[PDB]
Design a binder for this molecule. Structure first.
Ligand code: Y01
Ligand code: Y01
Ligand code: Y01
Ligand code: Y01
Ligand code: Y01
Ligand code: Y01
Ligand code: Y01
Ligand code: Y01
Ligand code: NAG
Ligand code: NAG
Ligand code: NAG
Ligand code: NAG
Lengths: 824, 83
């Protein structure tokens, strides 16, 4: 139903003032790049009263008798209709358009009045009386963006105002989800003259969950594709099905081991993405075992199966464990970060990879030994595929990589130095620059992220909102000691508890010292004078000033009282200090704290400062560092010197940024150390280890440089990606290094073609399968999937190319006698 | 165990699925299922010499004054019995 009349009943009234609390839609018209035309305004108001004035809305102001309309719409069309007092917004005569154009032209130079509350009357002096009741000010400050009516353009020029806004009389909140879940999500936009771009119903995070469930078809499809490709490599559907089931069961048992055995109970979001990663990892192990199997079954076919199994385990387990353990340590290295989500994702993914390795070692030989048990063209095409792959990865690829052998060196060195310069000096990666309230958690084209990132800086009532200029306060506390109690390690996000200390303020020396501290702090440079706060500061000062009376019990004494006057007169004084001004004080007031017993337990002072609140890193770091360095000067009496070192402002974003900037580097260091150690221990030849380290550094620098060039911050994902990349790099270097060694050929140019022809198929298959398993996430809605897919593609296609070319064209300098490592 | 996976594949392939299925059943029965409602439930440092103080100063506010026996840090309240 929802059928009643609207507010415009030939009444020049209006519900309220357009505030920030309501719901906003943002309109751009078309390539026409103009909105001042009856079709645009009428279609905008019509799509308004169609897509939002149809569904039953029980949340409204209800200021009049109309049950389904309190304010008309709060749009440009209404503000035109209030001129020439045409009631229905549908009835416009295309002349009031010119009227308001001329009016905004002649009045925009004065932008400057807040409001005229009295009906048909102005409270304070205004430059012009030709303006209606708050028409021009409201229509300039709220509805139309900045490009309209600028003093930069000359006279006789007509502006464009490609963007406009439109409010809604209802109050934004979670209740809009229904409205959004049926009427807004499916259809594209309005007709070709008006197109909605940004929406601010306020359900960006509460509705998030739903999209998750609606976008799990892209993971599933991915799995399917993988299966197909594996059928091409190993022709038996049995092995493919059983290894995919092994991967799934590995994830399941890893969850079980994660939840109850390790016993810590919190499941973050990013853990889901883990699955995708492992889909492009576990399969690799198969492509190492199966292949080797055939080789052994091609060397001594008449032998007993048990011997072939023992030999293939002997020849595969070492490399499988090397690569799996390297990636697992690279994941577990995130257990040194101070955040919670990554500190759990690390452990989960690490346990997953380790269990997957164990299953690939045990379950897989079982199924491969238990696999002892018109189509002419369908078989000939596969035979030709095998022949082509063999002739390619045996004769063509080594020729291509070894005949040129010099262009690759210079080319990849240039790419490496470019990546190094682009990650280190000029466009270094930037810390996050968005408030914790609104992270970009959707696709960068969703109607929510548009309004939350781009359009929140074109409209006046948001730009001047960005012009807050709120100073930063400092506080000091002497009551409690800083200590955390509830599940620090592998936390719960629900662990907190307060406590106490043992100090006395009754000592007169402590009183004098507090007064001296305040006087001193009133001297430094990071201070801001207001001359207006009486109690919202040191309480001792105003208390002393208040105790100058006489004949009332104590009065007219010195500064260091005998504390028997003091303990009682604090309470005697505050009950009248509440009388004069500041009648209310609520749990964040510099007043001292009490207990069940009326003694004092916590003392809290507060001051303003000259540094302005911001979101950059260097400014806040300077503030914190210098001010804490000064506050560290305590040298005070025995009491209140312990549990003294207190300082806290509204600086949490800075904490997040610092924790990121330290965790990422520590994780990178640990992971690269483990990688180099494993490579050295598995190669037993120092020059090959040096070449592998150079290749790892090259691929890391190139991938991080391409990521930063494409434009990426460090929110919480890249903090894990930067460490995962250096663990996923060495996967190919280890194989190419093991295969290069133990080859029946002493010379340099020889024994390279051997290793390359022997493991190029496996490396290319692993690269392609991870590439295609990450390339099925690009079209999606939630952002994490897109980030992870792009990173996966860009890391695999780079690491394979380097570890093949820049390594083989380097490992041919080695001498046949070489180093052979130390003597075990 | 080369001989073990040589003449006895089925036992080694069945013990694995026994372990896997008991693991899945325990994991789906015992622990409380995750929520997935707030996408930023974790992003807050813990124990970094500037997160401890924030946590403590926020716990100081939640334990505000009550009309009687706040078990907390109130103002003057406990001595209003004169009226
Ligand atoms: C390179 C690899 C092989 C090193 C070992 C990796 C894991 C086996 C380790 C790394 C960090 C360890 C964790 C470090 C700290 C904790 C918190 C700890 O928490 C509690 O005891 C609180 C709950 C309770 O009271 O039971 C439980 C064990 C756990 C998860 C540990 C489980 C074993 C973990 C995951
Ligand atoms: C690895 C990922 C990328 C894909 C494979 C896993 C997903 C298909 C699963 C993992 C967790 C599942 C979620 C776990 C819990 C819920 C809550 C559940 O809530 C309700 O039924 C409504 C009531 C409420 O919980 O408030 C709806 C399904 C959903 C979102 C599930 C949807 C399917 C999810 C995202
Ligand atoms: C450990 C290996 C495997 C990876 C490479 C690590 C280091 C060789 C590099 C990579 C990024 C570098 C940092 C990139 C940027 C800066 C900022 C720079 O200070 C600036 O303000 C520079 C830019 C400017 O002048 O504005 C001081 C060096 C530092 C910390 C660099 C220190 C050296 C770092 C850690
Ligand atoms: C080789 C791998 C590990 C990737 C490279 C590391 C980056 C992902 C991170 C880790 C440390 C970060 C740096 C940590 C500290 C700073 C100082 C910070 O300084 C300021 O706040 C501004 C100073 C000024 O403007 O003069 C600017 C960002 C920067 C260079 C960061 C840039 C991005 C870095 C190099
Ligand atoms: C195996 C090899 C090929 C890896 C790459 C070797 C070099 C190209 C890298 C390794 C260490 C890097 C350096 C690590 C740290 C820094 C400090 C960083 O910050 C400053 O010196 C500040 C300059 C400023 O104030 O603007 C500038 C880049 C630089 C010299 C880096 C330049 C590139 C270097 C020499
Ligand atoms: C022989 C081959 C295998 C070497 C590796 C080539 C590709 C795997 C990579 C390496 C460098 C990458 C490029 C690094 C940087 C950019 C710029 C980037 O530009 C932007 O997104 C905005 C540019 C700007 O406006 O500054 C687009 C992707 C692109 C071309 C990347 C595309 C993929 C490239 C070519
Ligand atoms: C593995 C073999 C078959 C060689 C494959 C070579 C190309 C087909 C690959 C190599 C690197 C790929 C690129 C790696 C990364 C990107 C960035 C990617 O960026 C986005 O889509 C932005 C997503 C976002 O951040 O929202 C677009 C595709 C592109 C250029 C990829 C296109 C396909 C490329 C050029
Ligand atoms: C039953 C559930 C709980 C687990 C299923 C997984 C495995 C235990 C199954 C899947 C496929 C099964 C195999 C499917 C077919 C056969 C062939 C069967 O022998 C014949 O059919 C011979 C026919 C002939 O040559 O005359 C012997 C059992 C075996 C190996 C089965 C053994 C058990 C396997 C590996
Ligand atoms: C609008 O107001 C003017 C003057 O107040 C009046 O002359 C005109 O008739 C009104 N419009 C209508 C439709 O009555
Ligand atoms: C969007 O769909 C509507 C139908 O709901 C159609 O009228 C309009 O032309 C479409 N616009 C575009 C750009 O496809
Ligand atoms: C603080 O006030 C002025 C201005 O800095 C200075 O001259 C004076 O000596 C200082 N007083 C104290 C007690 O530090
Ligand atoms: C003060 O606290 C003590 C705690 O031991 C308690 O016994 C006493 O009753 C309290 N006094 C008042 C007036 O609440």
């Amino acid at each position: 139903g929802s059928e009643v009349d609207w507010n415009f009943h030939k009444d020049s009234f209006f519900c309220d003032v357009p505030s920030d609390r309501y719901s906003r839609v943002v309109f751009t018209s078309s390539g026409g790049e103009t909105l001042w035309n009856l079709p645009a305004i009428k279609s905008m108001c019509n799509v308004d009263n169609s897509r939002i004035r149809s569904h039953p809305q029980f949340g409204d102001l209800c200021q009049r008798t109309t049950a389904a309309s309190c304010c008309p719409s709060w749009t440009l069309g209404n503000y035109i209709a209030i001129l020439n007092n045409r009631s229905s917004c549908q009835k416009i005569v295309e002349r009031d358009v010119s009227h308001t154009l001329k009016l905004l032209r002649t009045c925009a130079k004065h932008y400057d009045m807040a409001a005229r509350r009295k009906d048909q009357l102005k409270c304070t002096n205004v430059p012009r009386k030709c303006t209606k009741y708050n028409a021009v000010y409201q229509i300039l400050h709220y509805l139309v963006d900045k490009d309209f009516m600028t003093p930069k353009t000359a006279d006789y020029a007509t502006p464009a105002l490609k963007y406009s806004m439109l409010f809604s009389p209802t109050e934004k909140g979670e209740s809009m989800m229904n409205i959004y879940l049926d009427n807004f999500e499916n259809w594209n936009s309005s007709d070709g003259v008006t197109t909605i771009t940004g929406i601010e119903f306020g359900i960006k995070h509460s509705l998030f969950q739903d999209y998750l469930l609606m976008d799990t078809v892209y993971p599933a499809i991915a799995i399917v594709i993988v299966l197909l490709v594996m059928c091409v490599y190993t022709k038996s559907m049995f092995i493919t099905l059983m290894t995919m089931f092994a991967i799934i069961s590995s994830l399941i048992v890893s969850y079980f081991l994660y939840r109850v055995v390790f016993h810590f109970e919190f499941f973050p979001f990013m853990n889901l993405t883990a699955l995708i990663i492992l889909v492009g990892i576990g399969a690799n192990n198969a492509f190492v075992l199966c292949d080797v199997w055939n080789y052994t079954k091609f060397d001594k076919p008449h032998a007993e199966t048990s011997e072939t199994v023992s030999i293939t385990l002997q020849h595969a387990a070492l490399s499988m464990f090397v690569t799996s353990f390297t990636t697992a340590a690279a994941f577990y290295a995130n257990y040194v970060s101070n955040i919670t989500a990554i500190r759990c994702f690390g452990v989960y993914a690490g346990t997953a990879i380790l269990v997957n390795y164990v299953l690939m070692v045990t379950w897989l030989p079982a199924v491969v030994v238990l696999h002892e048990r018109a189509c002419q063209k369908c078989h000939k095409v596969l035979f030709a595929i095998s022949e082509a792959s063999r002739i390619f990865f045996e004769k063509v690829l080594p020729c291509i990589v070894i005949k040129f052998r010099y262009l690759w060196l210079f080319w990849f060195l240039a790419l490496t130095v470019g990546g190094a310069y682009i990650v280190c000096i000029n466009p270094k990666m930037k810390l996050p620059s968005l408030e914790l309230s609104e992270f970009q958690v959707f696709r960068s084209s969703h109607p929510f992220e548009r309004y939350d990132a781009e359009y929140k800086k074109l409209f006046m009532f948001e730009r001047v909102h960005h012009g807050e200029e709120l100073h930063m306060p400092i506080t000091v506390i002497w009551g409690v000691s800083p200590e955390d109690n509830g599940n620090p390690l592998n936390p719960k996000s629900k662990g907190k508890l307060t406590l106490d200390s043992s100090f006395n303020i009754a000592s007169p020396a402590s009183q004098a010292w507090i007064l001296h501290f305040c006087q001193k702090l009133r001297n430094q440079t990071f201070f801001y004078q207001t001359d207006e706060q009486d109690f919202t500061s040191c309480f001792i000062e105003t208390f002393k000033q208040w105790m100058e009376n006489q004949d009332c019990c104590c009065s007219h004494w010195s500064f260091p009282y005998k504390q028997e006057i003091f303990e009682l007169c604090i309470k005697r004084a505050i009950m009248e200090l509440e009388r004069s001004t500041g009648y209310h004080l609520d749990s964040k007031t510099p007043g001292p704290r009490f207990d069940i017993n009326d003694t004092i337990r916590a003392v809290v002072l507060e001051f303003q400062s000259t540094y302005l609140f911001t979101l950059a890193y260097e400014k806040m770091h300077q503030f914190y560092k210098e001010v804490d360095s000064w506050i560290s000067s305590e040298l005070s009496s025995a009491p209140e010197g312990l549990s003294n070192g207190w300082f806290v402002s509204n600086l949490e974003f800075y904490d997040l940024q610092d924790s990121l900037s330290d965790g990422t580097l520590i994780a990178m260091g640990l992971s690269v150390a483990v990688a180099f150690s494993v490579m050295l221990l598995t190669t037993w030849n120092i020059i090959i280890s040096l070449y592998a380290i150079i290749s790892i550094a090259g691929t890391i620098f190139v991938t991080v440089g391409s990521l930063v060039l494409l434009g990426w911050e460090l929110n919480v994902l890249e903090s894990v990606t930067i460490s995962v990349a250096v663990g996923l790099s060495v996967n190919f270097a280890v194989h190419y290094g093991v295969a290069y060694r133990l080859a029946p050929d002493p010379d340099r140019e020889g024994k390279v073609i051997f290793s390359l022809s022997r493991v190029g198929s496996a490396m290319a298959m692993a690269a392609l399968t991870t590439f295609v398993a990450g390339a099925m996430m690009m079209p999606s809605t939630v952002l994490a999937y897109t980030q992870l897919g792009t990173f996966m593609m860009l890391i695999m296609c780079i690491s394979w190319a380097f570890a093949t070319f820049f390594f083989q064209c380097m490992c041919r300098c080695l001498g046949p006698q070489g180093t052979c490592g130390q003597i075990p | 165990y080369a001989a073990l996976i040589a003449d006895w594949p089925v036992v080694v392939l069945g013990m694995c699925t026994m372990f896997i299925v008991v693991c899945a059943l325990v994991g789906v029965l015992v622990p409380e299922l995750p929520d997935f409602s707030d996408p930023l439930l974790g992003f807050e440092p813990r124990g970094t010499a500037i997160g401890q103080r924030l946590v403590t100063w926020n716990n100081m506010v939640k334990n505000t004054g009550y009309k009687a026996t706040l078990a907390n840090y109130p103002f003057k309240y406990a001595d209003e019995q004169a009226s």
